Symmetry: D8
Subunit: 102 residues, 16 copies
């Protein structure tokens, strides 16, 4: 997708990784029409070293690894994520991801 | 300031009211070169009825009343708030408030 | 989607209703990112009178009711159905549905 | 005949080899004003090795060898085959062979 | 077909009705891809009154009724008749029917 | 005379050599204002070897040698022959010789 | 034929009626490809009253009636008469009839 | 005088040498305002050898030598001779000499 | 002839009537190709009353009546009279009649 | 004076030397405003040899020598001589000398 | 003659009437080619009343009446008088009468 | 002053030296606003040799030497002299000196 | 800020350092939204040698060091200082600092 | 003088009334080439009521009345006052009065 | 003379009436080529009432009446007076009267 | 000041040095706003040698040295001197110094 889009979710990868539940997001995004049993695996999992890292901080990394792969996708990725998140019921981040346009 | 700016802080008045401490913001914003002992009073305080409302929810309203008045201000209001927040050390919202441009 | 597309699946609604398994199609199309537990219900089911009609001829009607709703959809509907059918492994109808273009 | 025509019957040589009876087609096509006692012989027959191949699969090959020779013909070949097939009463393939135009 | 064609076979309906055998023509023309069991019937037969007319003169009328119906046909009718007659082996009339062009 | 004229009587030298009596033609053509006691002699006669050839086939050759010399003539040759033949009462060949024009 | 031609043979109808023998002319002109057993009759004969007129003067009138009818004819009439007279061996009048041109 | 004039009396030197009396012409032409006692002498006389030639044929030569000298003259020679001959009362040659014009 | 010519011989009708002998002129002018036994009569003679007039003065009048009629003539009249007078050997008046030109 | 003037009196030096009395001219011309006791002397006299010449012919020469000197003069010479001669009462030469103009 | 000429001799009629002898002028001017026995009479004489006037003053008036008549004359009058006076040997007035030009 | 002025008084230095008294002129010209006790001295006097010359002829020379010096002067010299002379009461020379203009 | 601004406060650094109290200015300017605990320190303090300098003259130097740093600032520096001074209640210098514009 | 000048000394009438001694100014300004014993009187004096006003405040008013009258003056008034003040040795106000330009 | 000249001697009629002696001027100006025994009288004298006026003041008036009349004169009046005064040896007023030009 | 100004007071330095009292001028000119205790000293005094020169002639030199220095001055020098002299009450020289303009 465009340049001004990757930069968006890039810097704002914290708010989006915070307000949306990840279970409710991952299982839905794959579910949405984007990634697959393979993609979400590699995204949801990590390098393996992350084990050094305490519990609080692995789910957040995961969730942060998600949007990076979603951004990876085809140009709808915006229109895909905005809707998926419209359903996750994280409207306050759907705005975040959409308002930069218009 | 411009139209596309009021709409920004308008819809995204939750993220900004969340990540930035309000004490550290109010006492700094007034401190910044914007509002005054009078402004911040009327903003920090509310109608009076808010008393019906429990503790959790009055500080959040307050903080949400702040950005509305900041938005009220002169066209720097952007460049004012982005910096004030650069100091509040809520960088993850300074981005939010800035990234919509560029 | 375009006019020359509805006419396509319209007249050629027999070949497409024949070569593709319906189970493998319905459960996949809904699955694909098109219709929903509601859509496929109303499509997979019929008016109710169809009961007059013998077994051979209700599944064929069903399957024929599917493509009509798929055609109903947004302009990808082509690009959606061509791929869904690329997976159903009814390539000899994916061609049918695609070859009219190019 | 044109390029976009050979490609048509080429990829869609299965549907056309399926829905139309071959007897009713061969004896009619030659009969139609296309091939001859010589053509249809060489088309209806094959290399000779096809003997390795079981019954189901030789008539289908034959029938598939027909359209290839029909395609071989002069530019009417379309308008010839569409009509011949209009008579074979395989309308659902006459459509197939025609609908790509218009 | 064109005007200058009907006039041709019109005035020159004697030479063409003379040099070509009619059996070898009728059974071939129908055979050719022009008329049908119905056409050739009505052409080969006549009003019924022709009975007044002696044998010599009914076959000639018949044969003369043929070219009139052939002329009746679609614009190939020229290119159809020239070839059919190329086979009847009445080359000396195929010339007649062709030479007016070029 | 023109090119498209020699080609005419050339290929159609059979019909014209058939329908018109030769006596009634030769004695009239010379008579017409074309050839002379010398021309018609050399045309009506032949090389001398023609003797190998049976009766049926010498008069036909003769008659066929006539039109070749008539064609030889000045540009009226058309308008000359068409009229001469209008008198020979071989109208069905006068047409032949004329209809190629107009 | 043209105007300046009728005027020619008109005024110079004496020289032409004098130098050319009439027998050798009449029997040749008709013979030439101009008039007919009917024309030459009416020309060679006269009204009937000419009987008042002596022998010398009826043949001269006749001969003078000839050129008038020859002039009557089609535009070759010049080119016809000049040649006919080239044969009559009245060259000294063929010149007369030709020299006015060129 | 012009070219097309010398050619006239040149070829038509017989008719003019025939119809006009020579006495009535010579004695008048000189008389007319053209030649002189010297000219007409040399014209009326000849080389001297003409003696070989019989009577009929010397006066005709003479008379034929006249028009040649008249033609020799100045451009009126036409308008001179036409009038002189208008008087000689050989009108039927005055026409001859004039009609080529107009 | 032109205007400036009549005026010439008009005023200068004395010199011309003086230097040229009249016998040698009259008998020559008529002789020249101008007037006739009739003209010269009426010119050479006079009204009849001239009888009142003595001898000296009638020949002079006559001679003066001549040039008036010569002037009367066709446009050569100049070129006619100049030459006639060139012969009369009245050169000193031929000059007179010519010199006004050039 | 002009060229066409010297030529005039030049060729017409006879008429002018004839009709005008010389006494009445010389004594008047000098008298007129042209020549002088010196000019007229040399003109009226001659070379001296003229003595060979008889009386008739010396006065005529003299008189002829006059006009030559008058012509010699300034451009009026025309307008001078025409008037002088208008007085000499040789009007019939004043015309001569004038009429060439106009 | 021109205007600027009459004005000249008009105002300067004293100098010119003074320096030139009148006898030597009158008898010369008439003599010159201007006036006549009649003109000079009427100029040289006067009204008749001049008798009142003494001798000195009548010759001066006379002489003054001369130039007035000379001025009266044709346009040479200048070129006439300048020369006449060039001879009278009144050069000092010839200058007067000429110098106004150039 | 101009050229055409010096030439004037130059040639006409006699009339002007005659009609105007010199005393009345010299004593006035100097008096006028032109020359001076020095100028008029050298003008009124002469070389000294003039003594050879008799009385009549020295005053005239003097007076003639005056106008030469007056002419010598500035461009008014005309307008100066014309007026000075208008006073000297030699009007008949004031005219002389003025009339050449206008 | 602009050039014509630095020159302003530069030359007029005395009036501005005089009329505005420094305490009321420093503590307000820093307070205003310009300098900081660091800036005002280095400005309010000096090199250290200033100790040679008596009391009167160090506060004045200080105050004079202030405006130099204020001038140092961003282009508002004008609009900043004019307002800060509008509050210091040194209006008579706010004018000074503003009036140079407009 | 210009508008932007009156406004200058108008608002900045305090600084200028402060830094320049008035004695040293008044006695110099009048002295300068501006006002007069009359002007400075009316300026230096006041309405008369000023008596209500204490000593401090009358000299200041006076001095303030001065510049108002100086401003009143002709357009040099600037260039006059700037120099006068250059001498008063109030350079720090000469700047004030000048710096607004340039 | 011009306007800017009358104004000159008008206002500067004192200096000119002062520096130039009047005797030496009057007797010279009249003498110069300007006024006359009549002019200078009326100028040098006055109305008659001037008698009221003492001696000092009548000569000055006189002298002042002079230049007024000199100014009255023709356009040289400048060039006349400047020179006259160049001689009066009042150079310091000749300058006055001249310097206004150039 | 301009060129045409220095030349003015230059040549007319006598009239101006005469009519204006010097005391009343010097003490006023310096007084005027031009020179100074230094200028007027050096102008009012001289080289020192002037002592050779008698009293009458030193004050005049002085006064003449003044205008030279006044001329020296800035371009008003005209407008300065004209007014200063308007006060000196030497109006008759103020005119002198002004009238050269306008």
């Amino acid at each position: 997708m465009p340049k001004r889009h990757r930069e968006h979710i890039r810097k704002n990868l914290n708010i989006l990784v915070e307000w949306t539940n990840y279970e409710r997001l991952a299982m839905e995004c794959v579910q949405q029409g984007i990634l697959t049993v393979q993609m979400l695996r590699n995204t949801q999992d990590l390098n393996g070293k992350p084990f050094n890292m305490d519990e609080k901080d692995v789910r957040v990394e995961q969730h942060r690894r998600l949007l990076l792969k979603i951004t990876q996708r085809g140009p709808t990725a915006y229109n895909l994520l905005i809707n998926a998140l419209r359903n996750i019921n994280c409207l306050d981040a759907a705005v975040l991801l959409e308002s930069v346009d218009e």
